[PDB]
Amino acid sequence: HHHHLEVLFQGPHMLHLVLYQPEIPQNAGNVARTAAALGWPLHLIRPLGFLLSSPKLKRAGLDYWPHVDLRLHDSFAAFLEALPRGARVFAFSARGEASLYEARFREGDYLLFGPESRGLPEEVLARFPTLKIPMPGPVRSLNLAVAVGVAAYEAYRQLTG
Amino acid sequence: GPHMLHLVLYQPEIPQNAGNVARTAAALGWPLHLIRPLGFLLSSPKLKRAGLDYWPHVDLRLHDSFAAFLEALPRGARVFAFSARGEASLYEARFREGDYLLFGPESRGLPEEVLARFPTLKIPMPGPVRSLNLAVAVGVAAYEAYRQLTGR
Numbered sequence: 435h436h437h438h439l440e441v442l443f444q445g446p447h448m449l450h451l452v453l454y455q456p457e458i459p460q461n462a463g464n465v466a467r468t469a470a471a472l473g474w475p476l477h478l479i480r481p482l483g484f485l486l487s488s489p490k491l492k493r494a495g496l497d498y499w500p501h502v503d504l505r506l507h508d509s510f511a512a513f514l515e516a517l518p519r520g521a522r523v524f525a526f527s528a529r530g531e532a533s534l535y536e537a538r539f540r541e542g543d544y545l546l547f548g549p550e551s552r553g554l555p556e557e558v559l560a561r562f563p564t565l566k567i568p569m570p571g572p573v574r575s576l577n578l579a580v581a582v583g584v585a586a587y588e589a590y591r592q593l594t595g
Numbered sequence: 596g597p598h599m600l601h602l603v604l605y606q607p608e609i610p611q612n613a614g615n616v617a618r619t620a621a622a623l624g625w626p627l628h629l630i631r632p633l634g635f636l637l638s639s640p641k642l643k644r645a646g647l648d649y650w651p652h653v654d655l656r657l658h659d660s661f662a663a664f665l666e667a668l669p670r671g672a673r674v675f676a677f678s679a680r681g682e683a684s685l686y687e688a689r690f691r692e693g694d695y696l697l698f699g700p701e702s703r704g705l706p707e708e709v710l711a712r713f714p715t716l717k718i719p720m721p722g723p724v725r726s727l728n729l730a731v732a733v734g735v736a737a738y739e740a741y742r743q744l745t746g747r
């Protein structure tokens with residue numbers, strides 16, 4: 435833990451939300467809405483399954499994209515190469531090795547989520563510590579935007595507490 | 596455990612949101628209440644698809660009106676009304692087995708008269724956004740309650 439005065443001169447405290455190759459624009463939009471709500475960076479790792487001009491990314495009566503700290507990466511490789519030295523990345527999977535709620539999040543952690551249809555590839559999962567959102571019911575996975583919100587807000591709870 | 600709260604959607608408008616919520620309800624093993632009128636037919640393929648193959652595992656309750664919902668509310672039961680204008684943070688609540696979590700329609704949220712009736716909870720949004728997506732808000736609220744009750 436940092437000294438109190440060091441913490442003071444650090445910014446509002448924040449994690450990075452990262453979508454690996456999102457396919458469905460409504461999912462990306464519903465994640466962006468969460469990112470802008472928290473004031474946290476949203477990283478989109480191409481290829482995306484949609485054009486950024488898609489009418490499906492917004493909603494009438496809503497405007498959040500102008501307030502999204504959007505980061506675009508051309509590939510997963512380029513994303514990794516762009517990480518600061520010592521970056522901590524948590525890969526989210528319903529087959530994850532530890533519970534989300536066991537994790538102790540820190541400033542500038544990266545929370546990494548897969549596409550709705552397939553999730554993160556096994557090689558990516560094997561590369562990072564993996565976190566599971568518990569599902570006591572007979573369900574294989576949650577909707578992407580829901581999983582991002584549950585994870586992001588648990589980190590928010592931890593950080594602001 | 597096991598643990599059980601109730602998830603309640605007041606006049607949900609978009610079938611994809613209701614199906615996503617059904618998926619979350621099935622994942623937690625919690626009943627899902629819908630209060631009519633809905634913005635979609637219950638026969639909707641988009642609704643069904645949004646819940647994938649999980650609808651068989653959803654304890655689905657339908658109410659013809661808000662009044663009907665209230666009459667189905669056991670004496671002493673607690674309701675939390677979720678609102679972006681809510682009075683207390685989600686994380687200040689201490690949830691209990693059997694609590695009802697109430698959410699409003701995507702396009703306008705819960706009526707003022709409904710907000711006035713129950714304690715209101717806000718999911719913090721320090722950034723400039725007016726509100727979260729309905730299914731995301733339900734997930735965030737439901738899983739904070741799950742975290743509290745499972746002791747982690």
Ligand SMILES: CSC[C@H]1O[C@@H](n2cnc3c(N)ncnc32)[C@H](O)[C@@H]1O
Pocket residue numbers: 525526527528529530546547548549550551552553554565566567568569574575576577578581
């Ligand atoms: C296959 S669902 C799309 C993405 O949502 C995330 N996700 C969905 N459900 C869960 C869950 N129970 N636990 C952890 N991550 C999840 C995962 O990052 C997945 O790649």
Ligand SMILES: CSC[C@H]1O[C@@H](n2cnc3c(N)ncnc32)[C@H](O)[C@@H]1O
Pocket residue numbers: 676677678679680681697698699700701702703704705716717718719720725726727728729732
């Ligand atoms: C108007 S968005 C649809 C519903 O989502 C819920 N909701 C969306 N964002 C929040 C938020 N920050 N806090 C509490 N509830 C929210 C509210 O119940 C609302 O009626």
